[PDB]
Amino acid sequence: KDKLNPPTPSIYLENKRDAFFPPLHQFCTNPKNPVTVIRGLAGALKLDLGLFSTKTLVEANNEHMVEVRTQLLQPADENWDPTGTKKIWRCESNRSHTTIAKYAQYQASSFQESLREENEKGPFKTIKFGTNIDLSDNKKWKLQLHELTKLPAFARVVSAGNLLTHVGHTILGMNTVQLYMKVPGSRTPGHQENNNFCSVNINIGPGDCEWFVVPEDYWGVLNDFCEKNNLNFLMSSWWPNLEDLYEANVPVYRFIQRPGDLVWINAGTVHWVQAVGWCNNIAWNVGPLTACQYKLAVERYEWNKLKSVKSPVPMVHLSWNMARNIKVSDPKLFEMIKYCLLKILKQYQTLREALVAAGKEVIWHGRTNDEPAHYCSICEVEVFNLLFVTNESNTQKTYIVHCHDCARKTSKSLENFVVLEQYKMEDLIQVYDQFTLALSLSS
Numbered sequence: 001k002d003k004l005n006p007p008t009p010s011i012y013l014e015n016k017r018d019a020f021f022p023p024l025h026q027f028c029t030n031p032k033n034p035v036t037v038i039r040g041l042a043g044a045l046k047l048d049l050g051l052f053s054t055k056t057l058v059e060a061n062n063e064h065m066v067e068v069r070t071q072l073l074q075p076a077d078e079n080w081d082p083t084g085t086k087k088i089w090r091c092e093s094n095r096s097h098t099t100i101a102k103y104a105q106y107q108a109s110s111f112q113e114s115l116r117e118e119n120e121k122g123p124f125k126t127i128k129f130g131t132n133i134d135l136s137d138n139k140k141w142k143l144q145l146h147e148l149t150k151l152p153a154f155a156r157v158v159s160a161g162n163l164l165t166h167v168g169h170t171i172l173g174m175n176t177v178q179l180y181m182k183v184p185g186s187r188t189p190g191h192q193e194n195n196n197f198c199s200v201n202i203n204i205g206p207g208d209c210e211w212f213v214v215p216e217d218y219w220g221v222l223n224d225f226c227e228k229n230n231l232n233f234l235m236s237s238w239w240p241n242l243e244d245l246y247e248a249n250v251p252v253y254r255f256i257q258r259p260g261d262l263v264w265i266n267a268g269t270v271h272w273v274q275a276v277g278w279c280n281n282i283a284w285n286v287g288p289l290t291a292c293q294y295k296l297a298v299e300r301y302e303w304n305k306l307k308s309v310k311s312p313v314p315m316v317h318l319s320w321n322m323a324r325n326i327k328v329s330d331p332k333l334f335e336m337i338k339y340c341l342l343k344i345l346k347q348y349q350t351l352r353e354a355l356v357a358a359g360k361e362v363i364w365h366g367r368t369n370d371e372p373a374h375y376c377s378i379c380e381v382e383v384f385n386l387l388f389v390t391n392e393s394n395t396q397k398t399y400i401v402h403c404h405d406c407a408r409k410t411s412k413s414l415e416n417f418v419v420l421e422q423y424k425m426e427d428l429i430q431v432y433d434q435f436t437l438a439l440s441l442s443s
């Protein structure tokens with residue numbers, strides 16, 4: 001069908017007025033739009049993309065680390081097995097490190113080589129993709145990060161309407177900017193974002209990228225394809241065969257992102273990308289305050305536990321911060337948060353009471369103000385409030401956190417552990433009790 005090749009939701013911007021017009025924000029965060037391409041965004045805001053050019057990056061921080069992915073240059077929208085015999089999803093890629101200076105030299109020489117060749121099944125040539133360049137340090141990237149404060153609020157790295165701002169600590173690559181340096185054929189394999197959070201991606205240019213997008217509600221079909229073909233959906237590198245998807249009645253959105261175009265990847269949207277030319281891209285996550293975002297983040301948080309994968313967004317910690325600090329006025333979002341908090345509060349009460357009835361002391365430990373969420377050092381599950389720490393780590397004040405189950409598996413009666421409490425019961429009950437739906441007259 002044509003229903004399987006739907007048009008891309010696309011907003012065409014001319015000026016600042018268009019960029020700050022509230023229907024834009026609403027269009028991006030509408031769950032019916034799996035992706036939104038905001039064309040002409042950088043030009044409309046007079047954003048200086050030059051601050052993210054390879055030449056500028058090399059001058060700024062020439063020894064900055066780059067995670068190199070070495071890949072094969074595959075034809076068009078396809079992915080062939082090493083031998084060029086059949087199309088497959090798997091596309092593993094070896095990792096190494098280099099610096100911005102060294103990668104720049106390669107990106108530039110690759111272009112010169114192409115010019116010289118233009119004046120002259122596979123097997124395929126090898127290319128290198130410069131990935132995951134960490135732009136978190138404001139003292140190294142001051143002008144770069146400042147330029148991105150010119151965006152409308154809903155798309156910024158930091159804003160009051162961004163759940164990731166309410167986490168209250170850094171989640172590298174989500175509430176900090178990552179940069180990608182590309183040559184033609186550089187591929188971002190298929191995935192969903194961490195905990196299904198929206199992503200913002202700006203192409204710096206000078207060349208284009210081609211994007212492939214599948215709506216969130218078809219992710220199970222792709223997960224099933226992965227399980228059938230011995231791939232881990234979450235953790236392996238795969239490039240979907242478009243003929244498999246068409247045969248499975250999965251719609252695929254496909255489009256070109258030109259320099260200065262902003263791509264909004266909506267919550268839980270499955271996507272993959274290839275560079276058509278030589279370009280750089282910048283990206284980060286945003287978590288709009290909508291029922292759909294919160295729900296999908298919680299679903300993936302729980303799915304991650306079943307798949308034994310760490311959630312980079314600590315959804316327990318975040319939910320308590322939301323209750324302390326955000327006046328929520330959408331009834332649907334409100335009820336989801338309230339439901340989650342009650343579950344958390346009740347499981348904590350059940351556990352705390354079992355510990356006390358077993359004669360185990362609970363030690364008042366408290367918390368530092370900007371202290372991150374904790375995860376179990378063994379199984380990597382988020383641990384909230386009651387921290388299980390060995391007698392030795394407690395004495396040494398390293399406070400290495402375990403969850404209850406992992407502690408119990410190590411030390412049957414918890415004789416090797418102390419139990420540390422970061423929040424008083426009465427304080428958590430109050431935050432819950434005082435978290436009520438705020439009235440807003442708007443839709």
Ligand SMILES: O=C(O)CCNc1cc(N2CCc3ccccc3CC2)nc(-c2ccccn2)n1
Pocket residue numbers: 069093129131132180187188189191192193194201237273281282283
């Ligand atoms: O191509 C762009 O402009 C966007 C790149 N986006 C990426 C890029 C990226 N990587 C670079 C591409 C790549 C190439 C080859 C193998 C693996 C990977 C994954 C890491 N990883 C992720 C990622 C990872 C975990 C959760 C959410 N997102 N996203």
Ligand SMILES: [Fe+2]
Pocket residue numbers: 191192193199
């Ligand atoms: Fe990503």
Ligand SMILES: [Zn+2]
Pocket residue numbers: 376377378379380381402403404405406407
């Ligand atoms: Zn554990």
